[PDB]
Amino acid sequence: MQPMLNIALRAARSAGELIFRSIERLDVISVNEKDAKDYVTEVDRAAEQTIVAALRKAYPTHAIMGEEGGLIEGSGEGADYLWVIDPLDGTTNFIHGVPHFAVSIACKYKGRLEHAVVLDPVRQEEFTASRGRGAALNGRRLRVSGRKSLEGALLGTGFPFRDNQIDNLDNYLNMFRSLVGQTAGIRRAGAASLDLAYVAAGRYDAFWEFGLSEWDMAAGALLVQEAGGLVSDFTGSHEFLEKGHIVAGNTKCFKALLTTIQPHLP
Amino acid sequence: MQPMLNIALRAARSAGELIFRSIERLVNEKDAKDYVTEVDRAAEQTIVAALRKAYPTHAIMGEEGGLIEGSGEGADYLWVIDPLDGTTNFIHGVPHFAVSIACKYKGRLEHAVVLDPVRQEEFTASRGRGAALNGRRLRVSGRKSLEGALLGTGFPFRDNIDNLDNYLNMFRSLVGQTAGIRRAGAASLDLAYVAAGRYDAFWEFGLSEWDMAAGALLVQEAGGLVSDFTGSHEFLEKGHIVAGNTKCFKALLTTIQPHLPPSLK
Ligand SMILES: O=C(O)c1cc(O)c(O)c(O)c1
Numbered sequence: 286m287q288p289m290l291n292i293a294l295r296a297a298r299s300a301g302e303l304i305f306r307s308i309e310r311l312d313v314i315s316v317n318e319k320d321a322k323d324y325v326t327e328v329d330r331a332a333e334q335t336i337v338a339a340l341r342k343a344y345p346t347h348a349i350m351g352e353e354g355g356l357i358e359g360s361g362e363g364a365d366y367l368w369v370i371d372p373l374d375g376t377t378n379f380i381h382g383v384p385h386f387a388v389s390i391a392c393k394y395k396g397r398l399e400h401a402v403v404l405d406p407v408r409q410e411e412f413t414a415s416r417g418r419g420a421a422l423n424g425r426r427l428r429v430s431g432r433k434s435l436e437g438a439l440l441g442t443g444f445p446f447r448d449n450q451i452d453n454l455d456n457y458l459n460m461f462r463s464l465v466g467q468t469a470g471i472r473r474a475g476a477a478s479l480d481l482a483y484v485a486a487g488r489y490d491a492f493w494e495f496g497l498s499e500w501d502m503a504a505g506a507l508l509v510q511e512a513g514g515l516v517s518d519f520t521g522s523h524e525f526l527e528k529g530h531i532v533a534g535n536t537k538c539f540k541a542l543l544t545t546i547q548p549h550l551p
Numbered sequence: 552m553q554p555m556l557n558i559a560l561r562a563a564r565s566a567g568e569l570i571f572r573s574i575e576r577l578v579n580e581k582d583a584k585d586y587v588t589e590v591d592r593a594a595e596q597t598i599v600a601a602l603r604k605a606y607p608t609h610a611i612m613g614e615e616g617g618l619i620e621g622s623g624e625g626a627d628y629l630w631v632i633d634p635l636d637g638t639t640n641f642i643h644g645v646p647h648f649a650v651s652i653a654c655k656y657k658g659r660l661e662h663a664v665v666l667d668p669v670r671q672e673e674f675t676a677s678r679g680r681g682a683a684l685n686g687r688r689l690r691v692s693g694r695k696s697l698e699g700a701l702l703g704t705g706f707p708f709r710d711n712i713d714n715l716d717n718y719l720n721m722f723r724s725l726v727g728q729t730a731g732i733r734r735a736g737a738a739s740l741d742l743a744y745v746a747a748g749r750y751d752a753f754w755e756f757g758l759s760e761w762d763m764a765a766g767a768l769l770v771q772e773a774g775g776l777v778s779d780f781t782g783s784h785e786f787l788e789k790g791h792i793v794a795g796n797t798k799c800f801k802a803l804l805t806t807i808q809p810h811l812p813p814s815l816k
Contacts, residue, residue, distance in 0.1 A: 313687065315690070315693060315748065318694060318695065318698070318699060321699065377701055377730045377731045378701075378731075378733075381692070381749050381750070381751075382748060382749045383701070383744065383749045383750075384670055384672075385647075408646060408669065408670065431579070432580070436580075437580055439639060439640075439645070444726070446726075447726065447729065447730060448727075449727070454723065454726060458719050458722070458723065461719070462712070462715065462719065465706075465709050465715060466709065468709065469639050469709070470639045470706075470709070470734075470736055472640075472645070472734055472735065473733055473734040473735075474733065474735060475731055475733055483645065486644070487643075487644060488643055488645050489643070489645075490643075
C-alpha cells in the first residue's frame with residue numbers, strides 16, 4: 286500500500302512465477318547430482334535479475350545486496366536505501382522439488398528495516414510488512430500467537446552448515462535437547478525466511494537458528510516485529526543481521542526460548 | 552487407475568475439503584485437542600461412509616474408531632485410515648498435513664492415497680501399478696549416495712533421555728554428508744515425498760500403522776525400498792521405518808543400525 290512496498294511485492298511475484306515454472310520443469314525432467322548446484326545457481330541468478338531489474342526501474346539510485354550479486358552501492362539520497370535480497374531461500378528444498386521455499390526482499394533505510402516481502406510462490410502466500418504499519422498475509426493482518434509458555438509450543442529451527450563444525454553442532458543439539466520436553470514439536474522446514482514468516486503469522490510460537498545470512502533474516506524479522514513479536518540475537522541484543530544468530534517469537538515464547546538457550550552459550 | 556483406488560481417492564478428497572475448511576477458521580490451548588478430535592472424527596466419518604457405500608463387507612481400521620472386522624470375502628480387505636496426519640501442524644495452522652488411506656488385501660498393501668489438501672497434492676498407488684502425484688508417474692530420486700542427500704525424519708513422542716539420545720546420535724552422524732535433514736511433521740507426507748523423489752530417504756520410529764501404510768506403498772510403487780530398522784518387512788507392526796531410493800535407503804539403514812539399542816533390533 287506504500288509505493289516502495291508495492292514495487293517490492295510485484296518484483297517478488299515475478300521472481301516467484303519464474304521459480305514456479307522452473308520447479309515444474311525440474312519435477313518432470315530430473316537433474317542428477319553434479320548438475321544440481323549449477324541448476325540452483327541458474328534459477329537463483331535469473332530470479333535475482335528479475336527482482337533487481339524491477340527494483341532499479343523504480344529506484345535506480347538505491348543500493349542492492351543480493352545473495353548472487355553481492356553489494357552494490359547507491360548514490361545521492363538513494364544511498365540511504367539498501368535492498369537485501371534472497372531471490373530463492375530454501376535452495377536445497379527447491380532443487381529436490383520440496384514445495385517449501387520463498388523469495389525474500391527487505392528494504393533498509395539508513396540501516397533500519399523499512400519494508401519486507403516473503404513470498405511462497407507454490408502456496409501463493411505473500412507476507413508483507415512496513416515499519417510501523419503491521420504485517421499481512423495476502424492482505425489479511427498478521428498477529429503472533431498468544432501461547433503463554435513453551436508448554437505445547439511448536440518451534441521452528443535450522444542448522445545451515447553441512448560442514449565440519451563440531452563445536453557449533455554439539456551446542457545446537459544441547460539447545461535442541463533442552464527444548465524437547467516442554468514443546469509439542471520442533472520443525473526443520475529448510476527456509477529461514479518462511480520460518481520467520483510463520484512466527485509472524487502465529488504458525489510457529491518461536492524460532493531460533495544460527496549461521497544465517499542477512500538476506501535470510503531481514504524480511505522475516507520485520508514481519509515478526511510488525512506482527513507484534515520479538516526478535517534478537519542469541520545474546521538478547523539487536524545485532525542479529527550482522528551476527529547471523531536469531532531468536533524470534535511471540536512475547537512469552539521468545540523470552541522463554543532465549544532464557545533456555547543461555548546455558549549453552551558462554 | 553482401478554475402481555477401488557478411485558473410491559479411496561474420492562473419500563480422501565471429501566475428507567481433505569473438510570480439513571481445509573476447518574484450518575481456514577482457526578481458539579486457545581485447552582480447546583485445541585477437542586477441536587482436533589472433532590475434525591479428526593468428522594474426516595474419518597466422511598472417509599468411512601464413502602468406503603462402506605462401495606465395500607460394506609470390508610474391514611476398517613481408523614485412528615479415531617479402532618478396528619471393525621469385515622465379513623465374507625470382504626474380510627480379506629482392511630482399510631487403514633489416518634483421517635488427519637500431522638495434527639500438531641494442523642492445530643497450529645502449519646499447512647503441512649495429509650489424509651492417509653491404505654487398503655490391504657490378505658495383509659499386503661494393495662491401494663494407497665496420501666492427500667495434501669492445502670497444496671492439492673494427491674499421491675496415489677496400487678500394487679504393481681506404480682505411483683502418481685496428481686496423475687503424473689512418480690519415481691524415487693536417482694542420487695547414488697548420501698553426498699548432498701535431503702533426508703526426512705520425525706519424533707512422534709517427546710515424553711522420552713531414553714529414545715532422545717539414540718536419535719540425536721543418528722542425526723549427528725548424518726549431518727556431514729547430507730545437504731539437509733528435514734522435520735516437516737507428517738510421516739505420510741514424508742513417505743510420499745520419498746516416493747516423488749523430494750526426499751532421498753526417510754527414517755522414523757514410534758509410528759502407528761495408519762501413518763506408514765499408504766506412504767510405504769507409495770515408495771514401493773515409485774521404485775524405492777521400505778523396511779523396518781532391522782531390514783525386515785514388519786514396519787507396520789513395529790512402528791519403525793526406513794524408506795528411500797535404493798542406494799540412499801541402503802546407506803541410511805547401514806548408518807542407523809549401530810546407533811540403536813538391541814530394543815529397536
Ligand atoms: O540439517 C538441517 O537441520 C538443516 C539443513 C539445511 O540445509 C537448512 O537450510 C536448515 O535450515 C536446516
